[PDB]
């Protein structure tokens, strides 16, 4: 469910290596807000200094990838991002039936303000047999926008 998918673990791994110039698989605290900003997250300085005070328990002023996975899990656990897209698709379920027209679905994804490109959705529409019927549920399209 709210468990980190193998992809989400890789996405954070690429952003974590961008600042791993020590080939030690670790990064400094000064580059913590920079890695989070790479994923599009903007925590305030106090929010960062608060987690650092707890992680800076070793006194190494550094962070390794496993502990980094514990930081994203604290943000995205009981409040996965999936609850944000599903609640939006809800705004689009005017019939409380759990189904909307592919248009209202592609629209749910664009009005949200996601950095989605019309080409990426066209790929998500190919495996989401959006034909054969005429209307499609979003639970399948929600997991796709998060991470295949």
From Swiss-Prot:
Keywords for this entry?
Acetylation, Calcium, Metal-binding, Methylation, Repeat
Q: Where does Ca(2+) 4 bind?
A: 129, 131, 133, 135, 140
Q: Which residues bind Ca(2+) 3?
A: 93, 95, 97, 99, 104
- One term under GO cellular component: myosin II complex
InterPro entries found in the cross-reference section = CALM/Myosin/TropC-like, EF-hand-dom_pair, EF_Hand_1_Ca_BS, EF_hand_dom
> GO: which molecular function terms?
calcium ion binding; signaling receptor binding
* Residues with PTM N-acetylalanine: 1
**Domain named EF-hand: residues:** 7-42, 43-78, 80-115, 116-148
For Ca(2+) 2, which residues are the binding ones? 56, 58, 60, 62, 67
| Physiological role | Calmodulin acts as part of a calcium signal transduction pathway by mediating the control of a large number of enzymes, ion channels, aquaporins and other proteins through calcium-binding. Calcium-binding is required for the activation of calmodulin. Among the enzymes to be stimulated by the calmodulin-calcium complex are a number of protein kinases, such as myosin light-chain kinases and calmodulin-dependent protein kinase type II (CaMK2), and phosphatases.
Query: What name does the UniProt record give this protein?
Result: Calmodulin-1
């Amino acid at each position: 469910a709210d468990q980190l998918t193998e992809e989400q673990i890789a996405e954070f791994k690429e952003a974590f290596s961008l600042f791993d110039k020590d080939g030690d698989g670790t990064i400094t605290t000064k580059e913590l807000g920079t890695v989070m900003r790479s994923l599009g997250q903007n925590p305030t300085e106090a929010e960062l200094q608060d987690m650092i005070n707890e992680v800076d328990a070793d006194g190494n002023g550094t962070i390794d990838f496993p502990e980094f996975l514990t930081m994203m899990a604290r943000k995205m656990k009981d409040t996965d991002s999936e609850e944000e897209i599903r609640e939006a698709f809800r705004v689009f379920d005017k019939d409380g039936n759990g189904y909307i027209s592919a248009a209202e679905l592609r629209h749910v994804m664009t009005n949200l303000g996601e950095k989605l490109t019309d080409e990426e959705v066209d790929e998500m529409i190919r495996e989401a047999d959006i034909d054969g019927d005429g209307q499609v549920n979003y639970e399948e399209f929600v997991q796709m926008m998060t991470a295949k």
